[PDB]
């Protein structure tokens, strides 16, 4: 049926703490608490102007950003090893970045 | 669309003084006089800063707060018993939480 | 964050403004502090008469706008009154309920 509830179960299969957000600040789904997201989003909007091209990730552990689509960003709080996180993102995209760009176009 | 209308009619079935607001303070629906409602906001602000969990309530009678989703707050003025109020909120959540969460997402503009 | 958007909204029409609390707390301001400190005792006394929430008070070039119980907008401007009242009505629609929650008068 509806994605987002599908994206979150995917992510939770390997990370407890995440958020699926849009570029303006809209949280579509999040297990990260509001206090952390409020201080986190201004940093993400900055990097979004030219440091995270669509399809790329950005690391500052425990925070990680993945621009799945042009408008949709995944935010992780994790200490997983790098290759696991990149692997999660690669799979998440190839199973979701089509449906997600279709449901949340810019 | 009609989600807030359905939320309102569900609450009005039991309490007459209520409001539904966003967690940034936007009033979506309120039968409480806007002046009286805005004076409960110091309490709400403290609840949100202490990150009261989704599904949890807070009682300062006659005022009652219920965090149905991350971004949607139910407010009551009521003298009804706590066990009835807590049942009302759990049924309210069951029927409307998922929809409210999609219709009213938290936003950090 | 919310105050940073308030500042940006105001800045689209006037450049000399301040957003303060009832007790005088500066939240954001492009007005020289020299001016604000000689301007606050006037605000305090207007607040006493309980200049109502939503109303403004003109003393050109100075304008006060009580957006919420606890938040005052101050402008130094030589714009016309209708333009100032229109900016205020717009400002209040976009920000008053948010501001009321972010900066509640306590007790
Ligand atoms: Cl929270």
What's the reported resolution, in angstroms, to a tenth? 2.2
Tokens of A92: 């998440």
Cα–Cα–Cα angle for A27, A29, A30, rounded to 5 degrees: 90
Separation of CA B103 from chain center = 15
CATH number at A52 reads 3.30.450.190
Into how many domains does chain A fold? Answer: 1
Q: How was this structure determined?
A: X-ray
Asked if residue B60 belongs to a domain, the reply is yes
Residues with Cβ < 8 Å from A18, sequence gap 6 or more?
A8, A11, A12, A30, A31, A32, A74, A75, A76, A77
**Ligand 1 centroid to residue B75 C-alpha, Å:** 18
Identify the helix (H) or strand (E) that includes residue C65: strand C62-68
Q: At what angle do helices B41-49 and C81-102 cross, to 10 degrees?
A: 60
CATH number at B57 reads 3.30.450.240
Query: Is A52 within 8 Å of A65 (Cβ atoms)?
Result: yes
CA A62, CA B75: separation in Å to the nearest integer?
A: 36
Residue A98 belongs to what domain range?
Answer: 5-103
Asked if residue B107 belongs to a domain, the reply is no
CATH number at C98 reads 3.30.450.30
CA A52, CA A56: separation in Å to the nearest integer?
A: 6
Torsion of Cα atoms, C68 then C69 then C71 then C73, to 10°: 60
**Ligand 1 centroid to residue A80 C-alpha, Å:** 24
Among A25, A73, A103, most B C-beta atoms within 10 A, so best to mutate, is A25
CA C30, CA C77: separation in Å to the nearest integer?
A: 12
**Secondary structure E strands in chain B:** 17-22, 27-30, 57-60, 63-69, 72-77
Identify the helix (H) or strand (E) that includes residue A75: strand A72-77
CB proximity B54 to A under 8 Å? no
Q: Which residue from C minimizes the CA distance to B44? A: C101
Q: Give the pairing of strands C26-29 and C56-59.
A: unpaired
Asked if residue C107 belongs to a domain, the reply is no
Asked if residue B9 belongs to a domain, the reply is yes
Tokens of C64: 């006060």
- Three-state DSSP class for A3? coil
**Ligand 1 centroid to residue C64 C-alpha, Å:** 35
Q: Residues of B with CB below 8 A from A24's CB?
A: 107, 109
Whose structure tokens read 């990150």?
B51
CA A93, CA A104: separation in Å to the nearest integer?
A: 14
């Amino acid at each position: 049926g509806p994605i987002i509830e599908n994206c979150a179960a995917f992510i939770e299969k390997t990370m407890s703490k995440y958020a699926i957000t849009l570029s303006d600040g809209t949280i579509l789904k999040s297990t990260i608490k509001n206090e952390t997201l409020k201080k986190t989003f201004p940093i993400l909007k900055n990097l979004l102007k030219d440091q995270i091209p669509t399809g790329s990730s950005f690391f500052k552990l425990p925070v990680v950003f993945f621009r799945v689509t042009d408008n949709v960003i995944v935010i992780l709080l994790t200490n997983e090893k790098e290759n696991i996180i990149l692997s999660m993102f690669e799979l998440f995209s190839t199973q979701f970045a089509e449906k997600l760009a279709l449901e949340y176009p810019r």
